[PDB]
Amino acid sequence: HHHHKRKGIILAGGSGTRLHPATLAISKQLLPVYDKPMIYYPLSTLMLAGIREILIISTPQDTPRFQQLLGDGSNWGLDLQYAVQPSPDGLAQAFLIGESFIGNDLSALVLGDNLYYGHDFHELLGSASQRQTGASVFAYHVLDPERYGVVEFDQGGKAISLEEKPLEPKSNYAVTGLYFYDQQVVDIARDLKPSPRGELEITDVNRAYLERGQLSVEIMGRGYAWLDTGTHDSLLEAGQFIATLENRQGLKVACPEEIAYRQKWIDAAQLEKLAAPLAKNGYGQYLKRLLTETVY
Amino acid sequence: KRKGIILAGGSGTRLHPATLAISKQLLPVYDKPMIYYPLSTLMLAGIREILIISTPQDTPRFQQLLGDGSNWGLDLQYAVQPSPDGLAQAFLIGESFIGNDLSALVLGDNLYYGHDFHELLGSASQRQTGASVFAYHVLDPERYGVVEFDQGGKAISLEEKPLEPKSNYAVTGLYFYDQQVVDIARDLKPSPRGELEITDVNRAYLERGQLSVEIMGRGYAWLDTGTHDSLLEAGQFIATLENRQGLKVACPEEIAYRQKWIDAAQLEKLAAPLAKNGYGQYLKRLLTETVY
Amino acid sequence: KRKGIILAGGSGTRLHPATLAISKQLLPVYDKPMIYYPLSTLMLAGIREILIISTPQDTPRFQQLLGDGSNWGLDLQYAVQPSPDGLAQAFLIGESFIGNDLSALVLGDNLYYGHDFHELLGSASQRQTGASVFAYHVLDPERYGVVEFDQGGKAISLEEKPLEPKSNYAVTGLYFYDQQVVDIARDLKPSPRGELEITDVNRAYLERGQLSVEIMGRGYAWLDTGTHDSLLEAGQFIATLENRQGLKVACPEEIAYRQKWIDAAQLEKLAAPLAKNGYGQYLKRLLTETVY
Amino acid sequence: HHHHKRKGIILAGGSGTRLHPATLAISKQLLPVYDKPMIYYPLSTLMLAGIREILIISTPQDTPRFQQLLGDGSNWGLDLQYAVQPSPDGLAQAFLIGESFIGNDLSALVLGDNLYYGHDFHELLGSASQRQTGASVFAYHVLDPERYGVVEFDQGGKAISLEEKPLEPKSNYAVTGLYFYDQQVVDIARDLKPSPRGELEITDVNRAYLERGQLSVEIMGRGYAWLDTGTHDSLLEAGQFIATLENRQGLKVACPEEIAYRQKWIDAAQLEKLAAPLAKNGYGQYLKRLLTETVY
Numbered sequence A, D: 001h002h003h004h005k006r007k008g009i010i011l012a013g014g015s016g017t018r019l020h021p022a023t024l025a026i027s028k029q030l031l032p033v034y035d036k037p038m039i040y041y042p043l044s045t046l047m048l049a050g051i052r053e054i055l056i057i058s059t060p061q062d063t064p065r066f067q068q069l070l071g072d073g074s075n076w077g078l079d080l081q082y083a084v085q086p087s088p089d090g091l092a093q094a095f096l097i098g099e100s101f102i103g104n105d106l107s108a109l110v111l112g113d114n115l116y117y118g119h120d121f122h123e124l125l126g127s128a129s130q131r132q133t134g135a136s137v138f139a140y141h142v143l144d145p146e147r148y149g150v151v152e153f154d155q156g157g158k159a160i161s162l163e164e165k166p167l168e169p170k171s172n173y174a175v176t177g178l179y180f181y182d183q184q185v186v187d188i189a190r191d192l193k194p195s196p197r198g199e200l201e202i203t204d205v206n207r208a209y210l211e212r213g214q215l216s217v218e219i220m221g222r223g224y225a226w227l228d229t230g231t232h233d234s235l236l237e238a239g240q241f242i243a244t245l246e247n248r249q250g251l252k253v254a255c256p257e258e259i260a261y262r263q264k265w266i267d268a269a270q271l272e273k274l275a276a277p278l279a280k281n282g283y284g285q286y287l288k289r290l291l292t293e294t295v296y
Numbered sequence B, C: 001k002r003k004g005i006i007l008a009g010g011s012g013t014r015l016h017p018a019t020l021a022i023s024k025q026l027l028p029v030y031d032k033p034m035i036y037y038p039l040s041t042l043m044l045a046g047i048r049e050i051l052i053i054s055t056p057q058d059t060p061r062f063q064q065l066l067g068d069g070s071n072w073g074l075d076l077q078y079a080v081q082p083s084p085d086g087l088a089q090a091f092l093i094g095e096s097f098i099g100n101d102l103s104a105l106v107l108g109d110n111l112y113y114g115h116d117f118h119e120l121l122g123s124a125s126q127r128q129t130g131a132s133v134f135a136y137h138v139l140d141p142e143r144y145g146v147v148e149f150d151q152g153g154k155a156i157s158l159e160e161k162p163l164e165p166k167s168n169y170a171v172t173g174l175y176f177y178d179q180q181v182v183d184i185a186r187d188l189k190p191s192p193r194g195e196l197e198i199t200d201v202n203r204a205y206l207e208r209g210q211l212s213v214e215i216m217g218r219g220y221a222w223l224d225t226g227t228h229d230s231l232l233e234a235g236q237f238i239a240t241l242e243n244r245q246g247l248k249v250a251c252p253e254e255i256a257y258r259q260k261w262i263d264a265a266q267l268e269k270l271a272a273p274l275a276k277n278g279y280g281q282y283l284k285r286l287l288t289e290t291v292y
């Protein structure tokens, strides 16, 4: 039968019991990093990549809290839809849950607990999303590559293997929780078998693209900060890091209102209304300052 | 016998958007939910029957977190504050819970630390008549109830958020009352800023010579949770203590255990669901380590 | 009468390159030089005659920083440790300074904080015979002198950096001795790792039943300065206390002032050269504020 | 009479009494930021700009400590010379003190207490130093522009005024403590008169270049961190910021040995020797890892 843009997914489900009891009353991706909820950072990340149709995947328990926080996205020039993940059966599951949302479009997956910062981050995202076929991932040098998907490179910089949490990592380059995919991903994810843990592995997805000669791995250099939210200690460092940048600059990191404003998905009048309910705190005052300041 | 209340109500829009999705006192300070700290404080004071007051939206979540308390040897109840009309409203909402008993109120977002905290709370809770509060030296007393002392160290006035504070001594968020507080609370009128003021309660006792203001010395940490920057500093402070010591601040299960409100067997069971993380490992280690 | 020693000697190459240019105990923890903290500790213990031992390179700089002590009502002297041959060498270098008197040793990079620290030090310094030390629960006891206690709480062994620690109780860097320590130090032989061990001194008193090990409870902060990460945590801990309180930890001038070793007029003069910064402003405010 | 590259200056003199008593025993620029002395960061910054001949200006009291720390630079492929600043008479004084060092060459001034971090920092420095005439400065958005030299821009992005610590800043763009100059600077600095404070102002120097149509002002964007070392509080945040980046990555910020190595001012054998004396700590172990790791 005859036939004739990129959608975003934020996976913000269960971190199981790993951070209990801190996370007994709410999901991790609603905990604040400094002044804003965690999910603002990966959300702003998708927005920075130019993505406006976004699916937020969470637990059944917490979907209402995400919905209360973010609405349908139309205040920030977005359309946000919602899906639930009954059981934390792995990251690749986002594509089965997100199958009808994705449709026949390209996609991007971002972990709902991943924080990024740096210069020309916009352009780094822009190059990944412009690649219309294949998958694109980012490799970041870390102290503890054993905890991550690890990329092995040959002498000419070419990616030649991927291993999920190897005990003896071939390099210190970890695959970050930000992923760009073409229209082949749903089918790749549908045919995965659970790993020995009992999860549908994103690293198997990425390996399938690697075996087709269609995985781009770009370096996210050391001049970027890819922050750890894995532990209570790392969470605290993430808050301190953002607080230090924000107090130094009088500018915010991953303020979604700002990113919409600079993308011109919202205008001055719209942003002025969003500042009204928050006028008596620093966040609404910050939104108001953005209306009459040129920031390069 | 003394009953406890934790007022863990709404902090307006002051910390939005971080508190949009959920109330402050369910956010963590480092490894545990903020409310673990004031709950632990009441438990250290020997108080086992405790009323938790939160917004109507968040009461299910406090309930889900803490249950009826029986697993930690407590008897928890729950009640709602529909609107943030002032801290003294705790005694009106809590009137039937209190009954004819002595009471203590702690604010749901106040963190305490220090040597002999147990005996400081115990000397306040043993005082069967009158009211006991604590005064603590702060940088910014305008934000609090401010105690003025005469040259003999005797408290002579209390002012709520004065524009010109008389000293740097702030009343902490921890209050012990006798059987008169309910009746004093019932007679309160709203202040200029629309609230039933805990400070007017304390002023009623001060006017009868019945307010014991004890100094919480500079060797105690009373931590600030009122701003994003201070919520952060507190996490860092707790983390530095717990990583130095291999011991936890305000772990309710440990406090129950050392009060002997639960025995070894029950603590073992509590450590089971969390066995794979540090928090349950910590509980397990408490069974066979002597900590002075 | 009891004399003090601060051992502020070399920490090898362990923290290089940060300590290449200058010794650790002249680096700041937040607003003040590390040594202000242990010096303040000795002063809180009532000790006014104090010997500062540093490397030969850095003694001029300790001298330049602190002078003879007379401006703060102290009597400071100085001596050198040519090589880091162990903490017990303090008593050999310090032999003639000590004379026939009681002594206390504090390590130059140890930070203490807590309620009733004054009375904890005072009960140790009042014990005119034997030796008093403090045991503190830590995560990593292998790094320290480790106390083992029997079931009655009585100390029964000390091991320096054991591979298999018997408890989590570390001996802190703060030691009170009677008139026997010099003679015990003189008889020490170097350990396998080439040092005159403070732990062998304490073991000599333990074998005579003369070692008082008191618990420094979990409500005290004994902060770690041994790593870059811990030096940082300490700055953050001090900063959080001082910014919350508008009061300083281990300001020597305040301690002198409250001991009444200097009077109002002398404190005023001390606040003059620093008047344009917070540290001198702080000193000036101490003249006309009552702090309990 | 007939005639026929860029030198660096680090100003690391007195911060007066402002941080006393912390700075009573040593100068500020020898205090560590996390694991390394402060002066390593601006030094590495000059090295990143490709500058190998560098003059360190300090107090007479502390010149030996700087010399003990850094030597003559030949271990790191540099030549380091030393000068003293008897009295803290302003930043522009570096050019009178440095006059014979500079000679007839181009120059760069960096404050000895300035910390920078970000992606493509190398390329940002490269563009400033390639400009062979005029001066080049960097403008950075900050919360407290009143404390700094402030750049005013017109509607087309063009710099039109500079004011030193204005009470009512025309923008939030502060001039950073990193400056590139052509051969005119010594003469400009010689003819300055002290300000009402009694200092030779770097902002007057920069204004003189602006009045000649020869000041380039480039934006150092918000994706860079220009950290504050002005206060005990900011110092502590600077240490936390570096510690968080370093523990996350297993890579160092402004390790001078590394920068020399990557510039190829030193070779593998030379770097191996520099690791020998530090082998039992993390810093020497880090130098050793750099010998057999490819880091992009």
Ligand SMILES: CN(c1c(N)n(Cc2ccc(Br)cc2)c(=O)[nH]c1=O)S(=O)(=O)c1ccccc1
Binding pocket: A041, A044, A045, A048, A116, A117, A118, A119, A120, A121, A122, A252, A253, A254, A255, A258, A259, A262, A263, D222, D223
């Ligand atoms: C610091 N960054 C940042 C930047 N650069 N910007 C400016 C910006 C926003 C949108 C566009 Br279109 C181009 C520039 C912003 O408004 N908020 C930001 O957080 S970032 O590009 O590194 C970043 C963006 C989104 C999430 C996390 C980091």
Ligand SMILES: CN(c1c(N)n(Cc2ccc(Br)cc2)c(=O)[nH]c1=O)S(=O)(=O)c1ccccc1
Binding pocket: B037, B040, B041, B044, B112, B113, B114, B115, B117, B118, B248, B249, B250, B251, B254, B255, B258, B259, C218, C219
């Ligand atoms: C550090 N403190 C503390 C202490 N002291 N203890 C020991 C202890 C617990 C219960 C009892 Br009856 C006696 C001693 C504990 O198990 N957990 C603690 O967090 S504390 O008394 O300052 C404290 C207790 C509760 C909440 C906040 C601080």
Ligand SMILES: CN(c1c(N)n(Cc2ccc(Br)cc2)c(=O)[nH]c1=O)S(=O)(=O)c1ccccc1
Binding pocket: B218, B219, C037, C040, C041, C044, C112, C113, C114, C115, C117, C118, C248, C249, C250, C251, C254, C255, C258, C259
């Ligand atoms: C916070 N502490 C402290 C206290 N408590 N005081 C008050 C004080 C000082 C001297 C005396 Br005689 C009695 C009380 C002070 O002036 N400075 C302090 O730093 S402390 O006793 O825990 C302490 C003292 C000295 C070094 C480190 C901590």
Ligand SMILES: CN(c1c(N)n(Cc2ccc(Br)cc2)c(=O)[nH]c1=O)S(=O)(=O)c1ccccc1
Binding pocket: A222, A223, D041, D044, D045, D048, D116, D117, D118, D119, D120, D121, D122, D252, D253, D254, D255, D258, D259, D262, D263
């Ligand atoms: C994080 N940065 C950094 C980087 N990028 N590098 C890598 C690098 C070093 C030299 C060259 Br030629 C090209 C790349 C490094 O070895 N150490 C560094 O600190 S940086 O460019 O932002 C920087 C360099 C020097 C001082 C402060 C920051």
Ligand SMILES: [Cl-]
Binding pocket: A220, A221, A222, A223, A224, D118, D119, D120
């Ligand atoms: Cl980079």
Ligand SMILES: [Cl-]
Binding pocket: B216, B217, B218, B219, B220, C114, C115, C116
């Ligand atoms: Cl105290």
Ligand SMILES: [Cl-]
Binding pocket: B114, B115, B116, C216, C217, C218, C219, C220
């Ligand atoms: Cl204690």
Ligand SMILES: [Cl-]
Binding pocket: A118, A119, A120, D220, D221, D222, D223, D224
């Ligand atoms: Cl940028």
